[PDB]
Design a protein around this ligand. Structure first.
Ligand code: HEM
Ligand code: HEM
Ligand code: NO2
Ligand code: NO2
Lengths: 176, 176
């Protein structure tokens, strides 16, 4: 299967843009909709690929898989696309050094796990494609989990891991 | 810098093909030369990108960086391009499972270090590009190290890590 995904902010698409929050660094132009395409009057295009696990260990994968919801739940009419760029200092670090910041210090997985099965979370990579961002992260959930997701954001943005994030944008969406 | 690299088997290039050893699975067609281009009458093209560290820890990087030779040494008139693909079962494993096979069991980095500084080794990734191979590995050295390189290839093709390799080709080259 084609692991590449494109996100085109413009006048067409499956998702209506509710709000774009330019958290850190240059933002993305406000647009009417986002069109998601599998494969590679529009304002911007983002792309990334699905890839293998980079940090999670087996016990962590087992916990996530036990409560990970699927995409495209009927109830999951809200979504958020959050492109993220990390710093050169982050990328120069070795594998043991990044894993320790990611979990042992920041507890990325343990914290995110608390918000499943409510939130469906998916990760795409794009630093290797030469894109402006390093990751395209995608979340979808029913309105009942909006407050919980907003809470999770504040939590991760306070984390040690986020000291290495240098560009970030929120594209809040509603399923059409 | 652009991190994409292309290897075109045909009748032009910086490198003459000495031989091709179809080690495992379908091979590559014999050609006169290989052309290497930086960016995205020819028989085949391979491509991959340089990426961040996936397994090596800080102390291993420091030991590697202490002896790793540069590319394009005057005496490094031989080169070997070895595309590699690993199994689906490999990519399904978690990060800890793969690290433990990579170093704890196979000692890929420790064995590799023994063959530096003679052998310059570079790694490119292409599974994420949808390529038929997962990695393009590049090696260049002087003739005095040809025998030691063949020794290295045998020590690695015998390790537990290589039990997950399901396709492999050796393209031996000579600088023009
Ligand atoms: C909601 C529940 C969440 C869960 C269960 C979760 C889980 C995970 C896991 C297990 C990984 C590691 C993947 C791997 O090993 O390759 C990861 C990576 C990542 N997550 Fe989350 N996450 C959640 C929320 C979030 C949020 C809200 C954000 C952004 C605001 C985010 C941003 C990222 C990024 C950027 C990465 C890549 C880290 C890197 O490779 O440097 N995640 N996530
Ligand atoms: C000659 C000395 C060598 C040294 C010092 C060395 C070192 C390394 C290191 C440290 C890594 C881990 C990179 C990371 O953490 O992302 C790596 C990856 C790799 N090397 Fe070697 N290597 C050598 C020879 C070879 C040879 C001869 C081959 C093939 C015959 C090879 C094939 C690979 C492959 C396929 C990977 C990717 C592994 C994966 O990501 O699953 N290497 N090498
Ligand atoms: O966990 N980032 O979808
Ligand atoms: O370690 N790849 O030459």
């Amino acid at each position: 299967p084609n692991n590449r995904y494109s996100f085109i902010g413009g006048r067409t698409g499956q998702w209506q843009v509710v709000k774009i929050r330019n958290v850190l660094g240059p933002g993305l132009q406000l647009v009417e909709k986002v069109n998601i395409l599998n494969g590679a009057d529009s304002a911007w295009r983002l792309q990334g690929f699905a890839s293998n696990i980079r940090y999670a260990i087996r016990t962590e994968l087992e916990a996530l898989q036990a409560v990970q919801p699927m995409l495209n739940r009927a109830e999951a009419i809200l979504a958020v696309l959050i492109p993220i760029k990390k710093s050169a200092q982050w990328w120069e670090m070795a594998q043991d050094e990044r894993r320790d910041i990611f979990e042992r210090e920041s507890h990325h997985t343990a914290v995110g796990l608390e918000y499943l099965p409510g939130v469906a979370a998916r990760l795409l990579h794009c630093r290797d494609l030469g894109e402006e961002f390093d990751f395209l992260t995608w979340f979808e959930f029913a309105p009942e989990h909006s407050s919980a997701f907003n809470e999770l954001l504040l939590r991760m943005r306070a984390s040690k891991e986020w000291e290495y994030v240098e560009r970030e944008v929120e594209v809040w969406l509603k399923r059409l």
